[PDB]
């Protein structure tokens, strides 16, 4: 199973791994002043990092299936997409491009929200060429997609 990380950046089980250098998640980075849910129409911006915004503090963008988006989050999170909980699927009609996420396989993925509310990833380059949807979330925890 892909590990979770606490807001001090320590692995809560298993062994820790680094993010792909080209991921939109840049570590180390603070987070977890507050858990702040946001709507997809109110996804945060880069310049919210220091000030926060109207809705509260901002460490970046987090997402889990539902879809549920957060601009900050205090509990355990994934730093890489837990691919054991994804399944192969055709490209969807995408509604939003949300960042570049490291897969639990070490590869870079483009991450999208689909019209059907699914979170989908597509491999960024190389032999890979894979499209997968996030279908299970047994630890009910988001991916940290981007850090501000
Ligand atoms: Cl997993």
mmCIF file of N, CA and C and ligand atoms in Angstrom:
data_model
loop_
_atom_site.group_PDB
_atom_site.id
_atom_site.type_symbol
_atom_site.label_atom_id
_atom_site.label_comp_id
_atom_site.label_asym_id
_atom_site.label_seq_id
_atom_site.Cartn_x
_atom_site.Cartn_y
_atom_site.Cartn_z
ATOM 1 N N UNK A 1 0.845 -1.231 0.000
ATOM 2 C CA UNK A 1 0.000 0.000 0.000
ATOM 3 C C UNK A 1 0.850 1.238 0.000
ATOM 4 N N UNK A 2 0.454 2.225 -0.789
ATOM 5 C CA UNK A 2 1.136 3.519 -0.752
ATOM 6 C C UNK A 2 1.022 4.171 0.642
ATOM 7 N N UNK A 3 2.143 4.653 1.203
ATOM 8 C CA UNK A 3 2.055 5.321 2.524
ATOM 9 C C UNK A 3 1.301 6.665 2.560
ATOM 10 N N UNK A 4 0.819 7.008 3.751
ATOM 11 C CA UNK A 4 0.373 8.362 4.090
ATOM 12 C C UNK A 4 1.433 9.096 4.861
ATOM 13 N N UNK A 5 1.365 10.424 4.766
ATOM 14 C CA UNK A 5 2.288 11.346 5.418
ATOM 15 C C UNK A 5 1.507 12.270 6.330
ATOM 16 N N UNK A 6 2.104 12.592 7.481
ATOM 17 C CA UNK A 6 1.494 13.504 8.430
ATOM 18 C C UNK A 6 1.910 14.907 8.039
ATOM 19 N N UNK A 7 1.362 15.907 8.715
ATOM 20 C CA UNK A 7 1.641 17.299 8.343
ATOM 21 C C UNK A 7 3.058 17.772 8.753
ATOM 22 N N UNK A 8 3.810 16.933 9.462
ATOM 23 C CA UNK A 8 5.251 17.165 9.621
ATOM 24 C C UNK A 8 6.080 16.435 8.578
ATOM 25 N N UNK A 9 5.404 15.796 7.627
ATOM 26 C CA UNK A 9 6.056 15.204 6.476
ATOM 27 C C UNK A 9 6.643 13.832 6.727
ATOM 28 N N UNK A 10 6.328 13.232 7.878
ATOM 29 C CA UNK A 10 6.797 11.882 8.227
ATOM 30 C C UNK A 10 5.830 10.832 7.712
ATOM 31 N N UNK A 11 6.378 9.709 7.269
ATOM 32 C CA UNK A 11 5.587 8.603 6.763
ATOM 33 C C UNK A 11 4.881 7.938 7.953
ATOM 34 N N UNK A 12 3.576 7.683 7.813
ATOM 35 C CA UNK A 12 2.781 7.112 8.911
ATOM 36 C C UNK A 12 2.836 5.588 8.931
ATOM 37 N N UNK A 13 3.249 5.012 7.804
ATOM 38 C CA UNK A 13 3.612 3.608 7.709
ATOM 39 C C UNK A 13 4.482 3.351 6.477
ATOM 40 N N UNK A 14 5.063 2.161 6.396
ATOM 41 C CA UNK A 14 5.906 1.815 5.264
ATOM 42 C C UNK A 14 7.147 2.679 5.215
ATOM 43 N N UNK A 15 7.660 2.878 4.006
ATOM 44 C CA UNK A 15 8.867 3.649 3.787
ATOM 45 C C UNK A 15 8.548 4.885 2.959
ATOM 46 N N UNK A 16 9.243 5.995 3.241
ATOM 47 C CA UNK A 16 8.996 7.218 2.520
ATOM 48 C C UNK A 16 9.661 7.262 1.151
ATOM 49 N N UNK A 17 9.090 8.069 0.273
ATOM 50 C CA UNK A 17 9.552 8.185 -1.112
ATOM 51 C C UNK A 17 9.547 9.657 -1.463
ATOM 52 N N UNK A 18 10.376 10.039 -2.428
ATOM 53 C CA UNK A 18 10.412 11.425 -2.879
ATOM 54 C C UNK A 18 9.380 11.619 -4.021
ATOM 55 N N UNK A 19 8.941 12.854 -4.228
ATOM 56 C CA UNK A 19 8.071 13.176 -5.365
ATOM 57 C C UNK A 19 8.897 13.355 -6.628
ATOM 58 N N UNK A 20 8.234 13.192 -7.757
ATOM 59 C CA UNK A 20 8.874 13.396 -9.042
ATOM 60 C C UNK A 20 9.249 14.876 -9.115
ATOM 61 N N UNK A 21 10.494 15.194 -9.545
ATOM 62 C CA UNK A 21 10.950 16.603 -9.591
ATOM 63 C C UNK A 21 10.036 17.561 -10.380
ATOM 64 N N UNK A 22 9.417 17.052 -11.437
ATOM 65 C CA UNK A 22 8.446 17.805 -12.246
ATOM 66 C C UNK A 22 6.988 17.805 -11.713
ATOM 67 N N UNK A 23 6.721 17.108 -10.603
ATOM 68 C CA UNK A 23 5.399 17.218 -9.915
ATOM 69 C C UNK A 23 5.106 18.649 -9.497
ATOM 70 N N UNK A 24 3.817 19.020 -9.494
ATOM 71 C CA UNK A 24 3.388 20.305 -8.933
ATOM 72 C C UNK A 24 3.462 20.302 -7.393
ATOM 73 N N UNK A 25 3.692 19.149 -6.751
ATOM 74 C CA UNK A 25 3.950 19.133 -5.306
ATOM 75 C C UNK A 25 5.450 19.324 -5.055
ATOM 76 N N UNK A 26 5.812 20.377 -4.333
ATOM 77 C CA UNK A 26 7.215 20.662 -4.010
ATOM 78 C C UNK A 26 7.415 20.487 -2.516
ATOM 79 N N UNK A 27 8.212 19.493 -2.119
ATOM 80 C CA UNK A 27 8.498 19.222 -0.710
ATOM 81 C C UNK A 27 9.978 19.476 -0.354
ATOM 82 N N UNK A 28 10.283 19.771 0.938
ATOM 83 C CA UNK A 28 9.348 19.938 2.070
ATOM 84 C C UNK A 28 8.501 21.206 2.043
ATOM 85 N N UNK A 29 7.327 21.144 2.669
ATOM 86 C CA UNK A 29 6.382 22.263 2.639
ATOM 87 C C UNK A 29 5.397 22.133 3.796
ATOM 88 N N UNK A 30 5.102 23.252 4.476
ATOM 89 C CA UNK A 30 4.140 23.207 5.572
ATOM 90 C C UNK A 30 2.688 23.088 5.102
ATOM 91 N N UNK A 31 1.821 22.659 6.011
ATOM 92 C CA UNK A 31 0.392 22.527 5.724
ATOM 93 C C UNK A 31 -0.321 22.195 7.010
ATOM 94 N N UNK A 32 -1.631 22.393 7.017
ATOM 95 C CA UNK A 32 -2.458 21.889 8.094
ATOM 96 C C UNK A 32 -2.772 22.900 9.181
ATOM 97 N N UNK A 33 -2.734 24.185 8.834
ATOM 98 C CA UNK A 33 -3.260 25.219 9.723
ATOM 99 C C UNK A 33 -4.727 24.923 9.990
ATOM 100 N N UNK A 34 -5.468 24.657 8.921
ATOM 101 C CA UNK A 34 -6.869 24.256 9.017
ATOM 102 C C UNK A 34 -7.174 23.326 7.864
ATOM 103 N N UNK A 35 -8.182 22.482 8.038
ATOM 104 C CA UNK A 35 -8.744 21.769 6.911
ATOM 105 C C UNK A 35 -9.763 22.699 6.282
ATOM 106 N N UNK A 36 -9.562 23.019 5.008
ATOM 107 C CA UNK A 36 -10.434 23.952 4.309
ATOM 108 C C UNK A 36 -10.947 23.352 3.012
ATOM 109 N N UNK A 37 -12.208 22.929 3.014
ATOM 110 C CA UNK A 37 -12.828 22.427 1.795
ATOM 111 C C UNK A 37 -13.194 23.582 0.854
ATOM 112 N N UNK A 38 -13.017 23.357 -0.440
ATOM 113 C CA UNK A 38 -13.380 24.335 -1.443
ATOM 114 C C UNK A 38 -14.134 23.656 -2.566
ATOM 115 N N UNK A 39 -14.946 24.439 -3.269
ATOM 116 C CA UNK A 39 -15.619 23.947 -4.450
ATOM 117 C C UNK A 39 -14.686 24.061 -5.640
ATOM 118 N N UNK A 40 -14.943 23.250 -6.659
ATOM 119 C CA UNK A 40 -14.118 23.238 -7.875
ATOM 120 C C UNK A 40 -14.139 24.595 -8.608
ATOM 121 N N UNK A 41 -15.189 25.373 -8.354
ATOM 122 C CA UNK A 41 -15.284 26.746 -8.830
ATOM 123 C C UNK A 41 -14.462 27.716 -8.019
ATOM 124 N N UNK A 42 -13.952 27.277 -6.873
ATOM 125 C CA UNK A 42 -13.092 28.098 -6.027
ATOM 126 C C UNK A 42 -11.760 27.451 -5.690
ATOM 127 N N UNK A 43 -11.117 26.848 -6.683
ATOM 128 C CA UNK A 43 -9.806 26.270 -6.439
ATOM 129 C C UNK A 43 -8.806 27.385 -6.166
ATOM 130 N N UNK A 44 -7.934 27.204 -5.168
ATOM 131 C CA UNK A 44 -7.060 28.304 -4.752
ATOM 132 C C UNK A 44 -6.065 28.746 -5.829
ATOM 133 N N UNK A 45 -5.329 29.822 -5.542
ATOM 134 C CA UNK A 45 -4.284 30.322 -6.446
ATOM 135 C C UNK A 45 -2.912 30.460 -5.756
ATOM 136 N N UNK A 46 -1.861 30.515 -6.575
ATOM 137 C CA UNK A 46 -0.464 30.559 -6.103
ATOM 138 C C UNK A 46 -0.240 31.626 -5.025
ATOM 139 N N UNK A 47 -0.766 32.826 -5.276
ATOM 140 C CA UNK A 47 -0.557 33.980 -4.398
ATOM 141 C C UNK A 47 -1.393 33.989 -3.131
ATOM 142 N N UNK A 48 -2.186 32.933 -2.937
ATOM 143 C CA UNK A 48 -2.898 32.708 -1.679
ATOM 144 C C UNK A 48 -1.985 32.110 -0.583
ATOM 145 N N UNK A 49 -0.770 31.694 -0.948
ATOM 146 C CA UNK A 49 0.069 30.899 -0.053
ATOM 147 C C UNK A 49 0.343 31.577 1.282
ATOM 148 N N UNK A 50 0.806 32.825 1.225
ATOM 149 C CA UNK A 50 1.187 33.562 2.429
ATOM 150 C C UNK A 50 -0.005 34.221 3.128
ATOM 151 N N UNK A 51 -0.847 34.913 2.359
ATOM 152 C CA UNK A 51 -1.997 35.633 2.929
ATOM 153 C C UNK A 51 -3.166 34.714 3.324
ATOM 154 N N UNK A 52 -3.316 33.594 2.616
ATOM 155 C CA UNK A 52 -4.561 32.837 2.617
ATOM 156 C C UNK A 52 -5.506 33.498 1.628
ATOM 157 N N UNK A 53 -6.775 33.106 1.663
ATOM 158 C CA UNK A 53 -7.792 33.839 0.922
ATOM 159 C C UNK A 53 -9.028 34.058 1.798
ATOM 160 N N UNK A 54 -10.108 34.545 1.190
ATOM 161 C CA UNK A 54 -11.402 34.708 1.858
ATOM 162 C C UNK A 54 -11.802 33.455 2.655
ATOM 163 N N UNK A 55 -11.531 32.273 2.093
ATOM 164 C CA UNK A 55 -11.990 31.015 2.676
ATOM 165 C C UNK A 55 -11.094 30.473 3.785
ATOM 166 N N UNK A 56 -9.885 31.018 3.947
ATOM 167 C CA UNK A 56 -8.975 30.594 5.018
ATOM 168 C C UNK A 56 -7.551 30.357 4.546
ATOM 169 N N UNK A 57 -6.743 29.638 5.344
ATOM 170 C CA UNK A 57 -5.355 29.343 4.963
ATOM 171 C C UNK A 57 -5.211 28.403 3.770
ATOM 172 N N UNK A 58 -4.057 28.497 3.110
ATOM 173 C CA UNK A 58 -3.780 27.809 1.853
ATOM 174 C C UNK A 58 -2.380 27.189 1.865
ATOM 175 N N UNK A 59 -2.318 25.862 1.765
ATOM 176 C CA UNK A 59 -1.037 25.151 1.565
ATOM 177 C C UNK A 59 -0.890 24.622 0.123
ATOM 178 N N UNK A 60 -1.982 24.677 -0.637
ATOM 179 C CA UNK A 60 -2.002 24.246 -2.036
ATOM 180 C C UNK A 60 -3.344 23.657 -2.419
ATOM 181 N N UNK A 61 -3.326 22.498 -3.074
ATOM 182 C CA UNK A 61 -4.543 21.846 -3.531
ATOM 183 C C UNK A 61 -4.461 20.359 -3.183
ATOM 184 N N UNK A 62 -5.529 19.846 -2.581
ATOM 185 C CA UNK A 62 -5.646 18.459 -2.223
ATOM 186 C C UNK A 62 -6.936 17.948 -2.829
ATOM 187 N N UNK A 63 -6.987 16.668 -3.192
ATOM 188 C CA UNK A 63 -8.210 16.118 -3.771
ATOM 189 C C UNK A 63 -8.374 14.639 -3.390
ATOM 190 N N UNK A 64 -9.624 14.228 -3.219
ATOM 191 C CA UNK A 64 -9.977 12.826 -3.087
ATOM 192 C C UNK A 64 -11.249 12.564 -3.865
ATOM 193 N N UNK A 65 -11.542 11.285 -4.098
ATOM 194 C CA UNK A 65 -12.736 11.021 -4.839
ATOM 195 C C UNK A 65 -13.996 11.560 -4.152
ATOM 196 N N UNK A 66 -15.006 11.810 -4.970
ATOM 197 C CA UNK A 66 -16.239 12.449 -4.538
ATOM 198 C C UNK A 66 -16.820 13.283 -5.663
ATOM 199 N N UNK A 67 -16.076 14.289 -6.169
ATOM 200 C CA UNK A 67 -14.747 14.763 -5.765
ATOM 201 C C UNK A 67 -14.846 15.763 -4.613
ATOM 202 N N UNK A 68 -13.813 15.797 -3.776
ATOM 203 C CA UNK A 68 -13.698 16.781 -2.703
ATOM 204 C C UNK A 68 -12.357 17.460 -2.834
ATOM 205 N N UNK A 69 -12.369 18.791 -2.860
ATOM 206 C CA UNK A 69 -11.141 19.579 -2.949
ATOM 207 C C UNK A 69 -10.913 20.361 -1.681
ATOM 208 N N UNK A 70 -9.635 20.521 -1.320
ATOM 209 C CA UNK A 70 -9.245 21.298 -0.161
ATOM 210 C C UNK A 70 -8.126 22.240 -0.548
ATOM 211 N N UNK A 71 -8.068 23.404 0.103
ATOM 212 C CA UNK A 71 -6.934 24.320 -0.035
ATOM 213 C C UNK A 71 -5.970 24.181 1.144
ATOM 214 N N UNK A 72 -6.418 23.568 2.219
ATOM 215 C CA UNK A 72 -5.493 23.136 3.227
ATOM 216 C C UNK A 72 -6.031 21.905 3.908
ATOM 217 N N UNK A 73 -5.147 21.137 4.526
ATOM 218 C CA UNK A 73 -5.543 19.880 5.106
ATOM 219 C C UNK A 73 -4.530 19.478 6.181
ATOM 220 N N UNK A 74 -5.028 18.978 7.300
ATOM 221 C CA UNK A 74 -4.199 18.689 8.481
ATOM 222 C C UNK A 74 -3.942 17.216 8.700
ATOM 223 N N UNK A 75 -4.840 16.364 8.228
ATOM 224 C CA UNK A 75 -4.720 14.941 8.481
ATOM 225 C C UNK A 75 -3.763 14.257 7.534
ATOM 226 N N UNK A 76 -3.682 12.923 7.616
ATOM 227 C CA UNK A 76 -2.818 12.195 6.691
ATOM 228 C C UNK A 76 -3.146 12.490 5.208
ATOM 229 N N UNK A 77 -2.106 12.585 4.375
ATOM 230 C CA UNK A 77 -2.294 12.745 2.923
ATOM 231 C C UNK A 77 -1.359 11.839 2.140
ATOM 232 N N UNK A 78 -1.718 11.604 0.880
ATOM 233 C CA UNK A 78 -0.807 10.996 -0.073
ATOM 234 C C UNK A 78 0.054 12.056 -0.751
ATOM 235 N N UNK A 79 1.330 11.736 -0.970
ATOM 236 C CA UNK A 79 2.231 12.535 -1.817
ATOM 237 C C UNK A 79 2.355 11.940 -3.201
ATOM 238 N N UNK A 80 1.873 10.705 -3.370
ATOM 239 C CA UNK A 80 1.850 10.056 -4.669
ATOM 240 C C UNK A 80 0.503 9.366 -4.797
ATOM 241 N N UNK A 81 0.001 9.317 -6.031
ATOM 242 C CA UNK A 81 -1.250 8.626 -6.372
ATOM 243 C C UNK A 81 -1.165 7.112 -6.042
ATOM 244 N N UNK A 82 -2.077 6.629 -5.199
ATOM 245 C CA UNK A 82 -2.026 5.239 -4.782
ATOM 246 C C UNK A 82 -2.653 4.376 -5.869
ATOM 247 N N UNK A 83 -1.827 3.997 -6.850
ATOM 248 C CA UNK A 83 -2.293 3.345 -8.098
ATOM 249 C C UNK A 83 -2.973 2.010 -7.898
ATOM 250 N N UNK A 84 -2.698 1.324 -6.787
ATOM 251 C CA UNK A 84 -3.446 0.093 -6.452
ATOM 252 C C UNK A 84 -4.936 0.386 -6.303
ATOM 253 N N UNK A 85 -5.287 1.645 -6.029
ATOM 254 C CA UNK A 85 -6.679 2.055 -5.916
ATOM 255 C C UNK A 85 -7.229 2.761 -7.162
ATOM 256 N N UNK A 86 -6.459 2.744 -8.241
ATOM 257 C CA UNK A 86 -6.909 3.237 -9.519
ATOM 258 C C UNK A 86 -7.182 2.033 -10.426
ATOM 259 N N UNK A 87 -7.942 2.265 -11.492
ATOM 260 C CA UNK A 87 -8.210 1.224 -12.485
ATOM 261 C C UNK A 87 -8.149 1.838 -13.878
ATOM 262 N N UNK A 88 -7.716 1.029 -14.847
ATOM 263 C CA UNK A 88 -7.624 1.448 -16.255
ATOM 264 C C UNK A 88 -8.987 1.883 -16.798
ATOM 265 N N UNK A 89 -8.981 2.914 -17.635
ATOM 266 C CA UNK A 89 -10.214 3.484 -18.180
ATOM 267 C C UNK A 89 -9.885 4.406 -19.354
ATOM 268 N N UNK A 90 -10.860 4.640 -20.251
ATOM 269 C CA UNK A 90 -10.604 5.517 -21.385
ATOM 270 C C UNK A 90 -10.552 6.965 -20.937
ATOM 271 N N UNK A 91 -9.898 7.820 -21.713
ATOM 272 C CA UNK A 91 -9.865 9.246 -21.377
ATOM 273 C C UNK A 91 -11.301 9.739 -21.259
ATOM 274 N N UNK A 92 -11.540 10.626 -20.303
ATOM 275 C CA UNK A 92 -12.880 11.156 -20.064
ATOM 276 C C UNK A 92 -12.969 12.534 -20.716
ATOM 277 N N UNK A 93 -14.169 13.134 -20.728
ATOM 278 C CA UNK A 93 -14.338 14.537 -21.075
ATOM 279 C C UNK A 93 -13.899 15.281 -19.837
ATOM 280 N N UNK A 94 -12.799 16.019 -19.923
ATOM 281 C CA UNK A 94 -12.283 16.649 -18.717
ATOM 282 C C UNK A 94 -12.861 18.038 -18.501
ATOM 283 N N UNK A 95 -13.096 18.331 -17.220
ATOM 284 C CA UNK A 95 -13.651 19.602 -16.806
ATOM 285 C C UNK A 95 -12.576 20.542 -16.292
ATOM 286 N N UNK A 96 -11.575 19.984 -15.613
ATOM 287 C CA UNK A 96 -10.494 20.809 -15.076
ATOM 288 C C UNK A 96 -9.169 20.046 -15.078
ATOM 289 N N UNK A 97 -8.091 20.776 -15.376
ATOM 290 C CA UNK A 97 -6.717 20.293 -15.235
ATOM 291 C C UNK A 97 -6.240 20.756 -13.879
ATOM 292 N N UNK A 98 -5.797 19.838 -13.019
ATOM 293 C CA UNK A 98 -5.525 20.212 -11.620
ATOM 294 C C UNK A 98 -4.084 20.074 -11.126
ATOM 295 N N UNK A 99 -3.222 19.441 -11.912
ATOM 296 C CA UNK A 99 -1.792 19.407 -11.608
ATOM 297 C C UNK A 99 -1.050 18.198 -12.131
ATOM 298 N N UNK A 100 0.202 18.060 -11.700
ATOM 299 C CA UNK A 100 1.049 16.938 -12.107
ATOM 300 C C UNK A 100 1.444 16.192 -10.846
ATOM 301 N N UNK A 101 1.031 14.947 -10.801
ATOM 302 C CA UNK A 101 1.152 14.140 -9.600
ATOM 303 C C UNK A 101 2.113 12.993 -9.846
ATOM 304 N N UNK A 102 2.895 12.652 -8.834
ATOM 305 C CA UNK A 102 3.762 11.495 -8.894
ATOM 306 C C UNK A 102 2.847 10.301 -8.662
ATOM 307 N N UNK A 103 2.992 9.248 -9.469
ATOM 308 C CA UNK A 103 2.326 7.970 -9.222
ATOM 309 C C UNK A 103 3.083 7.156 -8.179
ATOM 310 N N UNK A 104 2.416 6.192 -7.553
ATOM 311 C CA UNK A 104 3.087 5.289 -6.623
ATOM 312 C C UNK A 104 4.152 4.442 -7.357
ATOM 313 N N UNK A 105 4.171 4.546 -8.691
ATOM 314 C CA UNK A 105 5.165 3.873 -9.511
ATOM 315 C C UNK A 105 6.385 4.735 -9.786
ATOM 316 N N UNK A 106 6.425 5.944 -9.221
ATOM 317 C CA UNK A 106 7.494 6.882 -9.522
ATOM 318 C C UNK A 106 7.338 7.777 -10.758
ATOM 319 N N UNK A 107 6.384 7.485 -11.624
ATOM 320 C CA UNK A 107 6.192 8.258 -12.847
ATOM 321 C C UNK A 107 5.327 9.493 -12.652
ATOM 322 N N UNK A 108 5.460 10.444 -13.571
ATOM 323 C CA UNK A 108 4.675 11.668 -13.516
ATOM 324 C C UNK A 108 3.367 11.465 -14.258
ATOM 325 N N UNK A 109 2.284 11.969 -13.677
ATOM 326 C CA UNK A 109 0.970 11.950 -14.306
ATOM 327 C C UNK A 109 0.347 13.344 -14.341
ATOM 328 N N UNK A 110 -0.383 13.609 -15.417
ATOM 329 C CA UNK A 110 -1.294 14.726 -15.489
ATOM 330 C C UNK A 110 -2.545 14.235 -14.775
ATOM 331 N N UNK A 111 -3.099 15.108 -13.940
ATOM 332 C CA UNK A 111 -4.327 14.847 -13.227
ATOM 333 C C UNK A 111 -5.451 15.798 -13.660
ATOM 334 N N UNK A 112 -6.627 15.206 -13.844
ATOM 335 C CA UNK A 112 -7.827 15.843 -14.374
ATOM 336 C C UNK A 112 -9.053 15.492 -13.533
ATOM 337 N N UNK A 113 -10.022 16.397 -13.480
ATOM 338 C CA UNK A 113 -11.382 16.035 -13.072
ATOM 339 C C UNK A 113 -12.202 15.818 -14.325
ATOM 340 N N UNK A 114 -13.015 14.760 -14.323
ATOM 341 C CA UNK A 114 -13.860 14.410 -15.444
ATOM 342 C C UNK A 114 -15.273 14.956 -15.249
ATOM 343 N N UNK A 115 -16.066 15.010 -16.328
ATOM 344 C CA UNK A 115 -17.458 15.500 -16.238
ATOM 345 C C UNK A 115 -18.284 14.640 -15.269
ATOM 346 N N UNK A 116 -18.014 13.334 -15.245
ATOM 347 C CA UNK A 116 -18.658 12.394 -14.317
ATOM 348 C C UNK A 116 -18.166 12.471 -12.856
ATOM 349 N N UNK A 117 -17.329 13.456 -12.532
ATOM 350 C CA UNK A 117 -16.807 13.629 -11.169
ATOM 351 C C UNK A 117 -15.630 12.728 -10.793
ATOM 352 N N UNK A 118 -15.221 11.843 -11.696
ATOM 353 C CA UNK A 118 -14.039 11.020 -11.458
ATOM 354 C C UNK A 118 -12.747 11.832 -11.546
ATOM 355 N N UNK A 119 -11.779 11.437 -10.734
ATOM 356 C CA UNK A 119 -10.414 11.885 -10.835
ATOM 357 C C UNK A 119 -9.660 10.869 -11.703
ATOM 358 N N UNK A 120 -8.978 11.397 -12.705
ATOM 359 C CA UNK A 120 -8.272 10.578 -13.674
ATOM 360 C C UNK A 120 -6.848 11.084 -13.780
ATOM 361 N N UNK A 121 -5.928 10.159 -14.043
ATOM 362 C CA UNK A 121 -4.545 10.530 -14.290
ATOM 363 C C UNK A 121 -4.140 9.960 -15.644
ATOM 364 N N UNK A 122 -3.290 10.690 -16.362
ATOM 365 C CA UNK A 122 -2.697 10.171 -17.616
ATOM 366 C C UNK A 122 -1.200 10.321 -17.536
ATOM 367 N N UNK A 123 -0.458 9.279 -17.895
ATOM 368 C CA UNK A 123 1.005 9.312 -17.837
ATOM 369 C C UNK A 123 1.507 10.510 -18.607
ATOM 370 N N UNK A 124 2.559 11.162 -18.101
ATOM 371 C CA UNK A 124 3.097 12.378 -18.725
ATOM 372 C C UNK A 124 3.946 12.136 -20.001
ATOM 373 N N UNK A 125 4.763 11.077 -20.005
ATOM 374 C CA UNK A 125 5.609 10.715 -21.172
ATOM 375 C C UNK A 125 6.235 9.314 -20.995
ATOM 376 N N UNK A 126 6.891 8.819 -22.049
ATOM 377 C CA UNK A 126 7.647 7.545 -22.057
ATOM 378 C C UNK A 126 6.740 6.360 -22.410
ATOM 379 N N UNK A 127 7.333 5.163 -22.435
ATOM 380 C CA UNK A 127 6.607 3.904 -22.651
ATOM 381 C C UNK A 127 5.215 3.909 -22.013
ATOM 382 N N UNK A 128 5.152 4.340 -20.749
ATOM 383 C CA UNK A 128 3.910 4.429 -19.975
ATOM 384 C C UNK A 128 2.620 4.486 -20.774
ATOM 385 N N UNK A 129 2.211 5.694 -21.164
ATOM 386 C CA UNK A 129 0.955 5.904 -21.890
ATOM 387 C C UNK A 129 -0.193 5.097 -21.268
ATOM 388 N N UNK A 130 -0.656 5.564 -20.109
ATOM 389 C CA UNK A 130 -1.700 4.892 -19.324
ATOM 390 C C UNK A 130 -2.709 5.910 -18.785
ATOM 391 N N UNK A 131 -3.976 5.512 -18.777
ATOM 392 C CA UNK A 131 -5.073 6.329 -18.256
ATOM 393 C C UNK A 131 -5.843 5.502 -17.236
ATOM 394 N N UNK A 132 -5.993 6.074 -16.038
ATOM 395 C CA UNK A 132 -6.508 5.401 -14.866
ATOM 396 C C UNK A 132 -7.432 6.342 -14.097
ATOM 397 N N UNK A 133 -8.453 5.786 -13.466
ATOM 398 C CA UNK A 133 -9.390 6.569 -12.663
ATOM 399 C C UNK A 133 -9.249 6.187 -11.190
ATOM 400 N N UNK A 134 -9.382 7.151 -10.288
ATOM 401 C CA UNK A 134 -9.312 6.836 -8.866
ATOM 402 C C UNK A 134 -10.666 6.255 -8.448
ATOM 403 N N UNK A 135 -10.739 4.930 -8.269
ATOM 404 C CA UNK A 135 -12.011 4.271 -7.979
ATOM 405 C C UNK A 135 -12.177 3.838 -6.507
ATOM 406 N N UNK A 136 -11.080 3.567 -5.793
ATOM 407 C CA UNK A 136 -11.147 3.258 -4.348
ATOM 408 C C UNK A 136 -10.374 4.258 -3.460
ATOM 409 N N UNK A 137 -10.850 4.461 -2.234
ATOM 410 C CA UNK A 137 -10.180 5.329 -1.276
ATOM 411 C C UNK A 137 -10.415 4.743 0.124
ATOM 412 N N UNK A 138 -9.809 3.572 0.360
ATOM 413 C CA UNK A 138 -9.968 2.850 1.635
ATOM 414 C C UNK A 138 -9.398 3.523 2.879
ATOM 415 N N UNK A 139 -8.473 4.457 2.722
ATOM 416 C CA UNK A 139 -8.017 5.243 3.869
ATOM 417 C C UNK A 139 -8.598 6.659 3.873
ATOM 418 N N UNK A 140 -9.544 6.913 2.970
ATOM 419 C CA UNK A 140 -10.307 8.173 2.924
ATOM 420 C C UNK A 140 -9.441 9.405 3.171
ATOM 421 N N UNK A 141 -8.431 9.561 2.321
ATOM 422 C CA UNK A 141 -7.402 10.564 2.465
ATOM 423 C C UNK A 141 -7.078 11.145 1.077
ATOM 424 N N UNK A 142 -6.840 12.465 1.002
ATOM 425 C CA UNK A 142 -6.587 13.111 -0.281
ATOM 426 C C UNK A 142 -5.149 12.991 -0.726
ATOM 427 N N UNK A 143 -4.930 13.183 -2.027
ATOM 428 C CA UNK A 143 -3.615 13.484 -2.587
ATOM 429 C C UNK A 143 -3.341 14.981 -2.479
ATOM 430 N N UNK A 144 -2.126 15.305 -2.078
ATOM 431 C CA UNK A 144 -1.636 16.677 -2.128
ATOM 432 C C UNK A 144 -1.158 16.904 -3.554
ATOM 433 N N UNK A 145 -1.970 17.594 -4.341
ATOM 434 C CA UNK A 145 -1.707 17.693 -5.763
ATOM 435 C C UNK A 145 -0.658 18.750 -6.045
ATOM 436 N N UNK A 146 -0.860 19.912 -5.438
ATOM 437 C CA UNK A 146 0.048 21.041 -5.611
ATOM 438 C C UNK A 146 0.340 21.676 -4.286
ATOM 439 N N UNK A 147 1.549 22.222 -4.174
ATOM 440 C CA UNK A 147 1.937 23.028 -3.027
ATOM 441 C C UNK A 147 2.199 24.439 -3.554
ATOM 442 N N UNK A 148 1.800 25.454 -2.790
ATOM 443 C CA UNK A 148 1.917 26.825 -3.270
ATOM 444 C C UNK A 148 3.316 27.366 -2.983
HETATM 445 CL CL1 LIG B 1 -3.051 1.735 -1.802
#
